[PDB]
Amino acid sequence: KKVVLSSFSIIGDITQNIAKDLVTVTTLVEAGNDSHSYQVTSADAIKIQNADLILCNGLHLEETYMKYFTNLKKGTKIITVTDGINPIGVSEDDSEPNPHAWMSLTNAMIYIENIRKALTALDPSNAKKYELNAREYSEKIRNSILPLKTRIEKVDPEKRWFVTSEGCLVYLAEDFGFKSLYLWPINSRSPSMMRHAINQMRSHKIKFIFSESTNSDQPAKQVAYETNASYGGVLYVDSLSKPDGPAPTYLDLLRFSLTKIVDTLF
């Protein structure tokens, strides 16, 4: 049985849905851990050796631990599952890519398709199954998320702002035609951006700001006060929740966070 290692929780869940136990899917950065300076353990090095295929996000999400993906099993490739996705930079201009591409309905289809392509190249005798599984999963995602999008699109163009703590929704904003405001581009803080956000909020009379599940709510709350906006609560973007939590799968993560956003905009 072939082994496929996913760099983190969201990618392993996607892969599990496409492969459905035709391969053994593993995860390096498990739910509740962040990729920025994640400590690759000894046990993780075994996962790395056992991999026949390794699936990364790219967009520099894995930058601090890519160096552990060496001395690999002969023939094991590293696939970046965000191929074909036009990156969004972390600056205002030439800058580092924002990694949060999976927070998008369109992109979910690209992750899935890239992962299907690679599983099929790895294990061609099961091609017909990956193809079926991938279509079903895509439909499944679309069915759960399109109604949320449809409702989001009923907002008038002046009132469409995704304000967060981390710049986690820049791709959703582009996918759905919103603009995104936030405090810092990636978890790991500056006063100028806080100042900028407060100004933009006031000018566009923005009513809500969110924090997220792997960061502090203190800044969002403080900015809510300073703008006379409301704190919108916690979104799930950077990691799947633990199994009792509200976002234990990729589909559930998309659904929970877009649901929370849409219920806040209405």
From TrEMBL:
Keywords: Metal-binding, Signal, Transport, Zinc. InterPro entries: AdhesinB, Bact_metal-bind_prot9, Lipoprotein_PsaA-like, ZnuA-like. Zn(2+) binds at residues 36, 100, 166, 238. One of its GO terms (cellular component) is cell envelope. Transmembrane segments: none annotated. GO terms for molecular function: metal ion binding. Its main location: other. It comes from the Bacteria. GO terms for biological process: cell adhesion; metal ion transport. Mn(2+) binds at residues 36, 100, 166, 238. It is found in: Cell envelope. Belongs to the bacterial solute-binding protein 9 family. PANTHER family: HIGH-AFFINITY ZINC UPTAKE SYSTEM PROTEIN ZNUA-RELATED, METAL-BINDING PROTEIN HI_0362-RELATED. This is Periplasmic solute binding protein.
